[PDB]
RNA sequence: GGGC
RNA sequence: CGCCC
């Protein structure tokens, strides 16, 4: 399934930092059956899961990049295969996950056999959900560098990040953005994999 | 319209 | 309106 026992032990220990009962956001970039960026966020603790995956459909990816995420495909080369399945399978049983537009999130969780996970859809408008878009990027821009491509709507807009979306959707529901220290759940060497002769 |  | 619900 991708991961050695040593890595599985590290992952399951890291995911115990998630409070099984706390408010948990989840957003993805890319199609549900072919995701390229996955993020979970718990505002109560400041814990976040954030990782990437290589697209199977390159033609769909390049098209999605111009209208949504703006991820350069070259930057996804060092990603760990099987991370998506391993993280989702390690999520607490009957966990309650909140997000904007639950349809794609549901299809991804169901494709991983996690029908037990309950989903709350906030179902806000694009304007209401992204009221604190500027404020989130102003505070947390250093947490993701992957969105370098120009994203259009014809008007240039801020690229869609799975992690930034989780934070800004929370700020919209709470009616404000808190100054809080964020903590990465996954080790950096687990997200990304490189020598020397050939 | 919502998601990408 | 590129795709998708
Ligand atoms: Mn989404
Ligand atoms: Mn998004
Ligand atoms: Mn629309
Ligand atoms: Zn990102």
Author numbering: 363 to 515, 522 to 561, 565 to 569
Per the authors:
We have also conducted a time course soaking experiment to explore the kinetic process of the LASV NP exoribonuclease function. Over the time course, the crystal cell volumes changed gradually from 474,825 Å3 to 444,643 Å3. Second, the electron density of the 5′-ppp moiety of the triphosphate dsRNA substrate became clearly visible, and that of an additional nucleotide C4 at the 5′ end of the complementary strand also became partially visible. Last, the side chain of residue Tyr-429 became structurally disordered, whereas those of other local residues remained unchanged, indicating that the Tyr-429 residue moved from the G5 base to stack against the next C6 base of the complementary strand in the 5′ to 3′ direction (3′-CCCGXXXX-5′) when the cytidine monophosphate was removed from the 3′ end of the cleaving strand (5′-GGGC-3′).
Lassa virus (LASV) nucleoprotein (NP) is the only known 3′-5′ exoribonuclease that can suppress type I interferon (IFN) production possibly by degrading immune-stimulatory RNAs. NP is a multifunctional protein involved in viral genomic RNA encapsidation, viral RNA synthesis, and immune evasion. Our structural, biochemical, and cell-based analyses have demonstrated that NP encodes a functional 3′-5′ exoribonuclease of the DEDDH family at its C terminus and that this RNase activity plays a strikingly important role in IFN suppression. We therefore propose a novel immune evasion mechanism in which NP suppresses the IFN induction by selectively degrading these immune-stimulatory RNAs.
